[PDB]
Symmetry: C3
Subunit: 388 residues, 3 copies
């Protein structure tokens, strides 16, 4: 029994209100500029020669001694083309202990006609012919055919195609015909199928937070304030500021030259562990909420089924009628348009995601080849051999 | 009052249906092959000598000059074993300005008996003894005892234990006795406790998406079509295709030689930010759903408690009876088997995860030692000293 | 009709119970020690000279030959300060083919007065003056002003400010005045605004799992057992063990020198894919649960609205009364304190997170400068030029 006489309140039911949230999903319409060229479009070829022109006219003669020089002769454009096309380089003659008669061959304009797939020079000298000159001439050459990845910069507006050097220096790509240049021993030639830039109109997904966090394939980036940003491989310019001349957001060039430490990655692992625990808390709070609902719903059905003996059977989708022997225990015996009370929609699910990992510029085959060639030169110029 | 006369419909309640999803959890039974050898099992030892055999018989004599050579003498297997066991290397004699009488010591078969922990040669030459020979002989040697990590390849079926060189070249491990080899100045000896391969039968967890995304400890990988894949440290072969001879999925060798750029990692950070916002949306949609349910349940209880004054007391687990002074306000006064209406099961929770980070091959101590030794040689062969 | 006669049970409703979970959120009060110094506070400057003192007194004279040496003369503290302040280095004289009269200039105590922004030496020698000495003297020098990042170690208790060398060697920072040192050609001077260490009292968030997974800004780390750990940039010491002298948790020094491979990063990608699928399962299980609730609630309302024709109108917040023409179809006609049945609280949401990525020590500008300077020396000492 209870005490209907006197009451307390009046009361109301407290509703639960979700916390507002400013993250949305956007399909941002951008112009995405690309400089993609696939295949082997880059040819690097070096060639130099060691010269040792000596004269032995006795210790009294002021001209007694050697004249040595590492002279670089990088191949011409046409030379580099046929080199790569044949994957062999052409050089002059290997001269060893050519004295007075044959000593003049140190200066001939040799008209390179000696073919090699790979050829490393030898640092040999000789001055053991009295009152006579002695000439030694060693040659080095190599060629490679690789795939060069061209990046994008701004220097203002209107992004520009650019080759990045391992040291950080940029070399703009010729947009007319076959950018070719020369540096010391080496000559570089780049020849893509089509010149200039390419761009498409496309919608990239984003999460609006003031802050835009976007993805485009394997590229993941923060979209800036004024809707214009350049990544290494691509530039994204949001129309609505299509007709506006803006300096885009610029990626850092050191981010592609300088590698990441193991600690930096472990730092990313610990940040992921933190968000994985974070999410486990939220999932636990939601699982507790379902527990509370299941307990409230068991109590509620236990009350309504007392009036509607056809209820529990409907909840179990079995024909049966309910008979309570206790306020908590019961017994079971045998037997157009719609209305949406919930307005629930398909649950958004985080889609799978895998970032792009391309490495550092120095590890590229083209720059690897140059670095090894220069390392081979340092290895062979360690000491002089006697061409006697 | 209302207008019972005329109606509209008939209506039905719209149920909410979850979107079907093809991700499941699998416990895939695989044969996992391992080549793990723990401890210091690798010994690298270099030894070479600088020789400068000169003769000064005046500028008229054709034999006047030096004969110099950097000759490599890598230690034998037994030499390398005792070197590492004592962490000291043995070399020949340090010869300085030994002329005509003692000049013959440039060729003796020195029978290395000079012990050093570390010894770097000196590039000294001398030809200032007339009508006489002069001999200079400098020696270099070093030894290291490290732990070598052996990887796995295919070359077909039946994965094979392999040592990877920094340049990308593979050297198969001898599965009989103590793989040993020699390259220039250096000799390498590897000696594990047990030979061949090891494998166990074990169940790796996976998420079936056509696509299998699996984890095995700190290893995380995509399981291929035909259930056979080789990682650097291990190979996983699914039985059911245990008795089938297949080429496994092969990891790329450049992925372990070439480091990742800082940009690649920031790219991973932005991809994680995207999925973190993604998940925050889904969590927000679920929190809104609970709000809707709490509002629908407050309305429902407000209706049932009008009939069952014992309800609200049961929902609050307090003995009390309800008395409504308004369709929304009320007053409160004092006072075997089971049936599962929900069929809810324990909520799956994403378990913690931390990837393995091992670094690049060049950073290994063994290859670091070789690289520094070769760098020390380039530093000392810069110019000649006068052993006068 | 049904069969009230005989029953079965008695039954009870099965409640759903959440699985207990030991993850919590902690606001751990720590003392965080910092050594942060912003701006250009580091000056590296090298200087050496090539000397070639030769005498040509004929092949009979025992003194005939050259005396060559690469001698390092690193600048003093005051020299380095004015060098960096002017970004130019001072050296001695460039001497070329100075013979007997002027040959004595190879030893003068030159009192460096030749200014250069950048100056690389030349390896030229000459011995073609009979009965006379010949002197050649080439100079090299460079200076840089960079920002040095100082790390933290333990060596026991009481963390210490430390500069890390690319080879792994540590150099403690002088906490009195302007740590300066010298190594071969190079001299290093570091001059921060304030000396010693800095620390603040602050609360870092953590997830308690035995295991503590914490975050502090862009730093993410596992908090150890005894509440004391040192990262490269900072040390965190939990009070409650403020007055206790403990060895902190020490980061590995190789983690900041050795880069991460592309494979290590792809491994992190696959681990993220695994947890992204993992979370998609849990989100799917929760979405199925809401489906079940929506079906149970549609059945329940369909039963209660039979008694309370004002219910469905309240659930739709529209004034209307319900009239059922079928146990599933109906027709619609026109028309202080609170009580919390749920005790639901604001849903915790995983906040955004971006790790810090700083790179490797070798890629620092200061050590990059030293490495390039030493590489330039190896490039110019390749062969001798004739200063005739």
């Amino acid at each position: 029994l209870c005490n209907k006489q006197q009451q307390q309140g009046p009361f109301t039911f407290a509703n639960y209100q979700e916390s507002p949230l400013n993250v949305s999903r956007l399909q941002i319409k951008v112009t995405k500029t690309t400089v993609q060229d696939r295949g082997k479009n880059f040819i690097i070829g070096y060639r130099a020669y060691w010269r040792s022109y000596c004269y032995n006219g006795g210790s009294l003669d002021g001209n007694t001694g050697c004249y040595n020089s590492l002279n670089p002769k990088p191949p011409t454009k046409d030379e580099l083309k046929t080199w790569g096309q044949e994957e062999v380089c052409y050089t002059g003659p290997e001269v060893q202990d050519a004295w007075s008669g044959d000593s003049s061959i140190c200066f001939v304009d040799w008209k390179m006609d000696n073919k090699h797939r790979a050829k490393e020079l030898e640092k040999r000298s000789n001055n053991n012919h009295f009152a006579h000159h002695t000439c030694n001439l060693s040659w080095r050459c190599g060629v490679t055919n690789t795939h060069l990845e061209v990046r994008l910069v701004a220097s203002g507006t209107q992004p520009q195609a650019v080759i990045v050097m391992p040291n950080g220096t940029t070399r703009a790509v010729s947009m007319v015909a076959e950018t070719f240049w020369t540096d010391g021993e080496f000559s570089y030639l780049y020849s893509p199928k089509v010149f200039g830039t390419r761009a498409e109109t496309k919608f990239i997904p984003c999460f609006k937070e003031e802050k835009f966090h976007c993805k485009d394939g394997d590229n993941f980036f923060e979209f800036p304030s004024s809707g214009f940003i350049c990544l290494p491989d691509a530039c994204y310019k949001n129309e609505k500021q299509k007709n506006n001349l803006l300096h885009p957001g610029m990626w850092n060039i050191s981010e592609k030259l300088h590698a990441a430490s193991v600690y930096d990655v472990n730092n990313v692992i610990h940040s992921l562990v933190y968000e994985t625990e974070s999410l486990r808390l939220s999932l636990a709070q939601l699982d507790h909420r379902f527990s509370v609902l299941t307990k409230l719903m068991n109590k509620m059905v236990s009350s309504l089924a007392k009036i509607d003996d056809r209820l529990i059977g409907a909840l179990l989708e079995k024909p049966m009628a309910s008979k309570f022997i206790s306020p908590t225990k019961f017994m079971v015996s045998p037997c157009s348009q719609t209305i949406d009370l919930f307005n629930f929609k398909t649950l958004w699910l985080p889609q799978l995601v895998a970032a792009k990992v391309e490495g550092v510029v120095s590890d590229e085959d083209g720059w690897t080849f140059v670095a090894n060639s220069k390392q081979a030169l340092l290895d062979t110029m360690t000491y002089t051999k006697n061409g006697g």
